[PDB]
Amino acid sequence: AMVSRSTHLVGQDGLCLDVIGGYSDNHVPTQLWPCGPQNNQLWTIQADGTIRTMGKCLVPNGHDPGSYTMIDDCNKADPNDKTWKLYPDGTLTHVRSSLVLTSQGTGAYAITTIETNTSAPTQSWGTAD
Ligand SMILES: *O[C](*)[C@]1(*)[C@](*)(O*)[C@](*)(O*)[C]([N][C@](*)([C])=O*)C(*)(*)(O*)[O@@]1(*)*
């Protein structure tokens, strides 16, 4: 049986997927940020295919290459918006589009996007406690 797992999502240079400012409002974007204990870097990978933080779901704002990612209300989002799959090698795919979560820098406020998979170092996401 698949069980939920809470984890940090660790990307390029060991920075963590982070909701900017720690706010849990709908449509707040995600970025990379130095890893810390804050709740906005704690993600739960669920069996249902959602990835959640602070009670909200990671979603792209659109389904095209270059769409930025954000959090939004889960129950309201359609499966296409909210379903992801994390592969063992680190690819984090947006299931409906086949695009993958991609970082856009390690400096502040570098908003993550979904892009065509190029097996770039910006497209590998590790789990950590
Ligand atoms: O600026 C940016 C930043 C990030 O987002 C982090 O994570 C946070 N923290 C908490 C605690 O939330 C801040 O605020 O912001």
Please give the Cα distance from 89 to 30 (Å, whole number).
22
Q: Where do we find the tokens 């940020």? A: 33
Which residue puts its alpha carbon closest to atom 4 of ligand 1?
A: 21
- Experimentally determined by: X-ray
Instruction: Give the integer Cα–Cα distance in Å for 91 and 86.
Output: 6
**Cβ distance 100 to 108 under 8 Å?**
no
Residue 95, C-beta contacts closer than 8 angstroms, at least 6 positions apart: 49, 80, 83, 84, 85
Q: What is the DSSP letter of 71?
A: E
* Binding site membership of 20 for ligand 1 (Cβ less than 6 Å): yes
Contact between 97 and 104 (Cβ < 8 Å): no
CA distance linking residue 51 with residue 48, whole number of Å: 9
Task: Write down the number of H helices and E strands in the chain.
Answer: 1, 12
Strands (E), the chain: 5-10, 16-19, 30-33, 43-45, 51-53, 56-60, 67-72, 84-86, 92-94, 100-102, 113-115, 126-128
Distance CA 21, CA 31 (A): 10
Q: Which two tokens stand for residue 81?
A: 């918006």
Task: Please indicate whether residue 125, judged by its CB atom, sits closer than 6 Å to ligand 1.
Answer: no
Q: Annotated binding site, which residues?
A: 21, 38, 40
Q: What is the CB neighbour count within 10 angstroms for residue 7?
A: 17
Looking at the DSSP assignment, which residues form a beta bridge with residue 100?
93, 115
Report how far ligand 1's centroid is from the alpha carbon of 39 (Å): 9
For the chain, domains (ranges, CATH) are: 5-118 (2.80.10.50)
State the CB neighbour count (10 A cutoff) for residue 37: 7
Question: What SS3 state is found at 82?
Answer: helix
CA–CA distance, 6 with 78 (Å, rounded to integer): 22
Resolution (A): 1.5
Asked whether 66 lines ligand 1 (CB < 6 A), one says no
Cα 108 to middle of ligand 1, angstroms: 10
